[PDB]
Amino acid sequence: RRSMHGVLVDIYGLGVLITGDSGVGKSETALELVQRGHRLIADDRVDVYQQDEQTIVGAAPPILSHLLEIRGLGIIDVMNLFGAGAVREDTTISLIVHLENWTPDKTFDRLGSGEQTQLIFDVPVPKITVPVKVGRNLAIIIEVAAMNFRAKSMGYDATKTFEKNLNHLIEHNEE
Template sequence: MDNQVSVRQLVEDNELKIISGEEFVDSKFITVSDISRPGIELTGYFDYYPSERIQLLGQTETAYVEEMDSETKKDIFQKMSLDDTPMFLISRNLKPAKELLQKAQENHIPIISSKLPTTRLSSLITEYLDQQLAQRQSIHGVLVDIYGIGVLLTGDSGVGKSETALELVKRGHRLIADDRVEVYQQDEKTVIGEAPKILNHLLEIRGVGIIDVMNLFGAGAVRSESEIELIIHLEQWDQNSNYDRLGSGEQKQNIFEVEIPKITVPVKVGRNLAIIIEVAAMNFRSKRMGFDATKTFENNLSKLIQENTNNKKD
């Protein structure tokens, strides 16, 4: 099944500790990123119990449980231990009640612990699950970090995307993914791209083959993931096409309904694509900071036209 995370993976990726139920962590899966802090359930109210969520017990919940008698604890934890309950998570390395240990074991639910405070732990796990459970799609292209800006290079096969990425790496920029970019939506305005595990740090250059960028250029030449902030589409030069010369024709491309700025760059013999793309990224960053050379040119042109018009009137 897609869009699920095993408890084992969650534990290993977030440096958590298994208190009990080691034998269940591979067969228990998390399918939602929401986390439940079962305060109202501890009072006995289970009409809307979100059993499919991680059940997080912090200092408040633990202190409340300590005030219960043993039979009430057993009854509450039995009701909380359903088939689809993936795990109990305890913050601050707090000691779980023996009744929780008993009922969790009987119902094949692992109990996991963390040294982190409850709120911080909840944020960490939620962010992790949002990323792992997010809908993903694969885009044909190359993703490069240029001056901290995630630039997705797209275009037909053979147009020179990988070779351009190699030149950019040589110029000090960082490769994220070549050939295939796995993308997911982090929030309403952000799309993240990363390489499939099998292609991590690898770049294919026709005539040379597969090269390991990290091995050849060092750890500083690669990055595991990046926000996609700009798309640069490379296409073969067509003398009949009307290419944007002033930078005023803004394009957008939707990925997961997030609009991302897009630039089309024609590929022609003698053009240094790496430098053009590098400057395009710098210009994009400059615009984002409020400095727009196109607007400056248009303003200067308007002033010149106005001055000439006034001179003719005089």
């Protein structure tokens, strides 16, 4: 039982823990995600515990239930503004999407080849890092991250397929 900083949203049936320094816009991004049909589990403070050898579960402290704090507007209740479809009691965490402010110095997976992971009580949760830069609609990206994540698990890995075709292309180009 430990508290993690971030926003737990259930996107397309997957638990996704959005992380990043305060100010990056995790709540605001989540707010957009519930409007797109996804569900909010916990905002800011995410209480997680290890359900087992391969499963972490996250939920919000009763006091923060259904709540989002948005700089400028203040506290909003998504259950009250969007109905039961916007909230969920809890979920197992399947993916972590870290929002890291963009700096000319840092790099990011340009190939899904990334094999990053973050430990949460002995459990290695896959982790994805996307850059926060102007003209970036974070919601769309986090959302497609879940989508792609789910697609890869269904047996559709665009990255692996492409690399396979690229070698074929090179073996050939060699004439």
